[PDB]
Symmetry: C5
Subunit: 287 residues, 5 copies
C-alpha cells in the first residue's frame, strides 16, 4: 500500500474555514450562473437551444451536488480542540464530488457538441460515445479512489485510474475530431470562439487526473485542503469559463443565420455592446 | 419464506455504490426536468399533453428519488466496514413503489398523447392504461411490502400474478393504440413512435424479473443488484423513452406546419436539420368589440 | 353512540405502510397536476383566467397541505412491539386535513363560478356567499371533530356537523342556481361540460359528511386507516377530476369566442386531438 | 408591569385554533401569490410597480408566516396543564413584527403605484411612506419585545406613542396622494382607489388596538384572541386591499388602451365585462 | 499583540439577540421582495443591457441564500443561559458566512455597473475581469485577516491583510470610476445623472465596510458585536437595493433612448415615475427563401 486516503488527515481551524469558504462561494457562483443562463436563454435561436438546456442542466446539477458536498463536509469532521478529526463520513466529501462529475461532465460534452456543426447520425453517434465515455471515465476513478477496499488498495487505485484515462482519450478524440470538422464550415469569428471553448474544457480536464494521484505522495491536513480547494476552483473556472464561451458561440451562430437570412430572431443580439443581428418577426401565414 | 432484501447487511463498497447510483439518478432527473421545461415550446398546442406528462413524470421521479435517498440514509447503521439494516430499510423499497404508482401512469399518457387516436377511443384508452398501470404497481406493493411485511411467499407470488394480469391489459391497449397510429403517420414519425413504444414496453420486462430475485435467496450483493438495476432501469426508460416521444411531438408539429394545418412562431430543428420555418398567425379584426 | 376519536387507535405495520403510500402518492399526483395546470395555462382566454388561477391556487395549497399531513403522520405514531402507537400529535393528522379543505374548497367554488356566465354583482355576490359558506362549513366540522373537548363530546360533534350541513346546502343552492342560469346562454357542447363539472364537484362532496360520522360506529386501526385513505382518494379524485373538467370548459368557451370573432387567441386550441380554434393575432394599431 | 402574552399557558382547544388560523393564513397567501403571478400581464408596463409590490408582499407574508408557524411549534410544550410557554414563545410575536416591517412598506408602494403621483412628488411620497411605516413597526417592536423583554409598562406605552406619530405621517402622505389622484381619474377608477385606500387605512386601526390588550391582563383566552385577530387582520387587509389595487391597475390600463395612449396584447375583463380589446404595436422599419 | 477582540467572543443580552435576528430576517425578506421585483421587471430592458438584469437578479439570489446561512449560523452560534446568550464554537461562522456572501455578491455589483456603462470590445471585457478579481481578492484578504489566520486574534495579520485588501479596493474604485467618467460624455443628460448617482450609492457605501472591520480593535462587548452585525446588515440592504434600483432606471433610459433614436425597438412602452420614455413597437416582418 502507498495510498494515504485524504479523509484520514485531521484539519486545522484555518483549513476547515478555508474549505467551507470555497465550497459555499462555489455553490453561490453556480446559483448566479444558473440565473444568468436562464435569463439569457432566448438570446439563442431554436437551432442551438440544446447548448442552453445542457448549460442550465449542468449548472443546476453542480449547484445541488455542491449542497450535498457542503452537508457532507459539515457532518464529516468533529472539532476536538486538537483540530477537526475526520469521522467515518469524511470519505463522503470526496464520494459526493464523483457523483457530481458523473452527471455534470457528460452535460459539458453535449453542450460543446451542440455548438458544433455535426448533423444527423454523425451528431447523435458522437454524443452517445462522448457521454458513455465521460460517464465511464468518472465511474472508473470512483471504483479506484473510493469503492474498492475503501480506496486504500494501491493496485486498484492505479489500475482503474488507467482504465479511466483510456475512456478520457476516447472522449478527447471524439470531441477534438467533431470540433476540427466544424471549424472549417464556420466563419472566422465563430471559428475562434469554438476553438477557445474546446481548449478551456479539454485543457482544464488535465487538472483532475493530476489531483487524483496526490494521495500517493503521502497524507496531511495541508494536502487534503489543497486537493479539496483545487478541485473546487477547477470545477467553478471550467464550468463557468467554458459555459460563457459556448454561449457567446451560440449567439454568434444565431446572429449569422439571421444575417444570412436563414432564420429570424425576435430581439437584437449583442456581444460586448456590439450589435450582431437586428430584431425580426416571421411573415404572417394564411391557411 | 421470502428472503426480504432489506434484511441483508451491506459492505462499505455496496453502501457507496447504491448511494452513488441513487443520487446520480436524482440529478439526471433534475437535468432532464430542466431540459424538458426549456424545450417545451418546440411543440404545437396539439401535442402539449406529451410535454405536461413528461415534465410531470420527471418532477415526480426527482422528488420520489429524494425520499428514496433519505430512506437509504436512515435505513442502515454503520458497523466498522458494514451497514446493518434497521426497521426503516424496507422504506427504501416501499418508496420506489410510491414512485412507480405515479411515474408509470404518466408514461402511458405521454405515449398516447403522441399517438394519433382521436375522440373517446383516445380518452377510453388513457383511462384503462392509467388505472391498469396504477393497479399493476399497487398489486406488487401489497405482495412485496404490505402483506405480512412481504415475508408471505403465497401473497408475494399471488399478487405478482394479479399484477401481471393488469400488466398485459396495459401492453395490449398501448400496442393496439400505436399499431393503429403508425399507418396514418409519415415514414419518419412512424419509425420514432415504434422506437418510443419499444423502449417503454420492452424495458417494463426488467421490473417483474427483479421482483422475483428475492426468491433465489438474500445477500448484500443481491440487494445491491436489485437496488442498482431498478435505478439504471428507471433512468434509462424514463429519459430514453421521454427523449423519443419529444422527437415525435416535434416531427408531428413540423409536419402540421408544412401541411399548412397550423403555424409555429419559431423554426423546428432535429439533429441540426431544419423541419419547419417560423411563422405568425394572420392579424385579424373583430366582428364586434369595445 | 359515543365518539371514539380515530387518533386513539393503534395501527398495524400493514396499515401504517398503506396510509403513508396513499398520502405521498396523493402529494405527487398534486405535483404532476400543478405542473400540467401551469404549462396549459395559456390555452385559455384572459376572460376565463380566474378558472386557471383558482385551479393552480388549489393544487398548490393541496400539495403543501399534504406535505404537512405527511409530516404530522411521521411524528404522530411511535413504533412498538404492538405496531404503531398514537402519541399526542396523532390528532394533527386529522387537524391538518381540515386546514387544507378550509382553503382548497373555497377555491373550488371560485373555479366553478369562473366558468359560469354570471355577470356584474350577481357574480361577485355568489362568490362571496359560496366562499364564506364553504369556509364556515369546514370551520364548523373542525370545531365539532377536533377543537371542542378534544373531539370527544358527542353533543358538539353532532351539533356543529348539522350547523356545517346548513352552510353546505347554502353553497350547493348558490352554485346550482348560478350553473342552471348559465346553461341556457351557453352552446350545446359547453352546456354539457359545465353540467358534468358541477356534478363531479357537488356529487363527490357527499363522501366527506359520511366519513365524518364513522367515528360514531366505534374506533379501530382498520376504521382509522379507512377514514384516512378514503379522504385521500376523495381529495385526489375530486380535485383532479373536477379541475380537468372546468379546464375543458374554459377552452371550449375560449375557442367559441375566437370562432364567433368576439376575441382572438395567439395559438390553436385542441380538445381530444380535435381542433376548436385557429391561432390569430390582433390587428397592429397606430397611436394618436 | 405589562402582562406579556407569551407568559399565558394555552388549552388544547386554543393551541389547535391558533395553528389552524396560522396555517390557513399561510395557504391563503400561497393561493394569492399564485393568482397574482398568473394575472401579472393583465396590467400595462405603466402600472407594473403595483404588481411587483403585491407579489413582493405576498411572497414576504407567505415566508414570514412559515417562520411564525415554526416559532409556534417550538414555543410551547404539551403538559398535564395544557401547552406551557417555553423561552421561545416570545418569538411567535417577535416574528410577526419582522413580517410587518417589510410587508407594510410594500403595501404603501402598491397604493402609490396606482396613484397618479408624477416625478419628484411621487418618489418623495414613497420614500416618506416607506421609512414612516418602517419606523412605525420598529418602534412597536422596541416597546413590546426588545426593551426589558416587553415588561416595562413605561417604554411599552412611550414607543407605542412614538409609533403612532409615524402612523399619522403615513396616513397623511397616502390620503394626500390619493385625494390628488381621484380628480384626474374616471368615475369607475375614482371609486376603486377610494375603496382600496379605505380597506388599507381603515384596517390599520385594528393593530394599535390589539397592541394594548396586554395591559388589561394576561390569559390563554386573551393570548389566543391577540394571535387569531392579528392573523385574520393580516389576511383580510393584505389580500382584500391587494385585489382592489389590481382591479384599479386593469381599469387604468384598459382606459389608456381605449384613449389610444397605449396598446395591450390581450383583451382586459372585469366581472365578465370586456374593458379593452387585444392590440399589437405597429411594425417599425430602420 | 492580541489587541484584536473577536466579536464572536462577546455574550449578548436578550434585547441584543432579538435585535440581531430581527434585522437579519428583515434583510433576507427585503432581498426576496427585491429578487421578485427584479424578475418581474426584467423585460423593461433591451437585450443590449440584459447583463445589468442577470447580474442584479444573480446578486439578489446570492444575498438571499447567503443570509439564510447567516441566520442558521446565528441560531446555532449562541446558547441561552442565566447570563444571556453565550457564544459557542460556531459563533465565528456568523461573521465567516458574511464574507462568503460579499465574495460573490460584490463582484456581481461591479458587473452590474459596467453593464450600464458604454465600454466596448476588449476595454469592456478587460475592465470586468479586473473589477471582479479585484473585489474578489479584496474580500478574500479581509477573510484571511479577520477569520482564517490564528482564528482572527493575530492583530498583525488583521491589520496587514486589511491594508492588502484596501490596495485591491482602490484598484476596483479606479477601474469603475474611469469606466463611468468615460461613459458620461457619450450618454444624454438624463442618463449621465443616473449613472453618476448609481456609481456614488455603490462606491460611497463601500466605505462603511472597512470602518466596521476595525471596530473590534476598540475592544469587545455585546453592544459592539450587536452594532457590527446590525450596521453590516443595514449596509448590505441599502447598498444592494439602493444601487440596484438605480442601475435599473439607467438600463430603461438607455433602452428608451435607443428606441427613440430608431437604433432598436421594444415590444412594450417604457415608463419612469409614470412619465412615458418610449412607445411599444414590433420588428418588421421578414420573408425568407
Ligand atoms: C466540472 C467538472 C469536471 C470538468 C470534472 C472533470 C473530471 C475529470 C476530467 C476526471 C478525470 C479522471 C481521470 C481521467 C483519471 C483519474 C480519475 C478522474 C475521474 C479524476
Ligand atoms: C419509470 C418506472 C417504471 C417504468 C417502472 C415500471 C414498473 C413495472 C413495469 C412493474 C411491474 C410489475 C409487475 C408486472 C409484476 C411484479 C410487480 C411489478 C410492479 C414490479
Ligand atoms: C378537495 C377537498 C374537498 C372537496 C373537501 C370537501 C369537504 C366537505 C364537503 C366537507 C363537508 C362537511 C360537512 C358538510 C359535514 C361534516 C363536516 C364536513 C366539513 C366534513
Ligand atoms: C399586513 C400587515 C399589516 C397591515 C400590519 C399593520 C400594522 C400596524 C399598522 C401597526 C401599527 C402600530 C402602531 C401604530 C402602534 C402600536 C404598534 C403597532 C406597530 C402595532
Ligand atoms: C452588498 C455587499 C457589499 C457591498 C459589501 C462590501 C464590502 C467591502 C467593500 C469590504 C471591504 C473591505 C476592505 C476594503 C478592508 C477591510 C476588509 C473588507 C473586506 C471589509
Ligand atoms: C427566510 C429566512 C429563513 C431562515 C432559516 C431558519 C430555519 C428555520 C428556523 C426558524 C426560526 C425559529 C423561530 C424564531 C427563533 C428566533 C430566535 C431569536 O429570537 O433570536
Ligand atoms: C451518465 C449519466 C448522466 C446522465 C445525464 C444525461 C442528461 C439528461 C438529459 C436528457 C433529456 C431528456
Ligand atoms: C445492473 C448493475 C448491477 C450491479 C450489481 C453489483 C453487485 C454488487 C457487487 C458486490 C458483491
Ligand atoms: C410546508 C412547506 C415547506 C416547509 C419548509 C419549512 C422549513 C423550516 C424547517 C425548520 C425546522 C426547525 C427544527
Ligand atoms: C412531495 C411530498 C414529500 C413530503 C416529504 C415529507 C418529509 C419526508 C422525509 C424527508
Ligand atoms: C387493511 C385494513 C384497512 C383497509 C381499508 C381501506 C379502505 C379504502 C377505501 C378507499 C375508498
Ligand atoms: C441548514 C438546515 C436547515 C435549512 C432551512 C432552510 C429553510 C429556508 C426557507 C425558510 C423560509
Ligand atoms: C377560545 C377563546 C378565544 C377566541 C378568540 C377569537 C378572536 C377572533 C377575532 C376575530 C376578529
Amino acid at each position: 500500500t502507498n495510498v494515504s486516503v485524504p479523509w484520514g488527515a485531521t484539519l486545522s481551524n484555518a483549513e476547515h474555514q478555508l474549505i467551507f469558504y470555497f465550497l459555499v462561494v462555489a455553490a453561490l457562483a453556480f446559483v448566479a450562473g444558473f440565473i444568468r443562463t436562464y435569463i439569457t436563454r432566448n438570446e439563442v435561436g431554436s437551432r442551438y437551444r440544446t447548448a442552453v438546456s445542457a448549460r442550465l442542466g449542468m449548472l443546476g446539477v453542480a449547484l445541488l451536488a455542491y449542497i450535498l458536498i457542503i452537508v457532507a463536509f459539515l457532518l464529516g469532521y468533529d472539532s476536538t480542540a486538537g483540530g477537526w478529526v475526520p469521522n467515518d463520513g469524511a470519505i463522503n466529501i470526496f464520494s459526493t464530488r464523483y457523483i457530481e462529475w458523473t452527471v455534470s461532465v457528460p452535460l459539458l460534452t453535449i453542450e460543446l457538441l451542440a455548438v458544433c456543426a455535426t448533423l444527423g447520425v454523425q451528431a447523435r453517434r458522437n454524443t452517445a460515445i462522448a457521454v458513455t465515455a465521460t460517464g465511464a471515465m468518472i465511474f472508473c476513478g470512483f471504483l479506484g479512489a473510493i469503492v474498492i477496499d475503501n480506496g486504500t488498495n494501491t493496485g486498484a487505485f492505479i489500475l482503474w485510474a488507467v482504465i479511466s484515462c483510456v475512456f478520457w482519450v476516447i472522449a478527447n478524440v471524439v470531441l477534438i475530431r467533431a470540433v476540427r470538422q466544424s471549424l472549417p464550415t464556420l466563419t472566422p469569428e465563430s471559428h475562434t470562439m469554438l476553438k477557445s471553448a474546446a481548449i478551456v474544457l479539454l485543457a482544464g480536464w488535465v487538472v483532475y487526473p493530476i489531483v487524483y494521484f496526490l494521495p500517493l505522495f503521502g497524507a496531511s491536513g495541508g494536502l487534503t485542503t489543497t486537493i479539496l480547494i483545487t478541485l473546487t476552483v477547477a470545477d467553478v473556472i471550467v464550468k463557468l469559463g467554458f459555459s460563457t464561451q459556448t454561449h457567446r458561440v451560440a449567439k454568434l451562430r444565431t446572429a449569422e443565420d439571421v444575417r444570412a437570412g436563414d432564420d429570424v430572431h425576435p430581439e437584437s443580439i449583442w456581444i460586448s455592446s456590439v450589435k450582431q443581428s437586428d430584431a425580426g418577426l416571421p411573415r404572417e401565414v394564411y391557411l
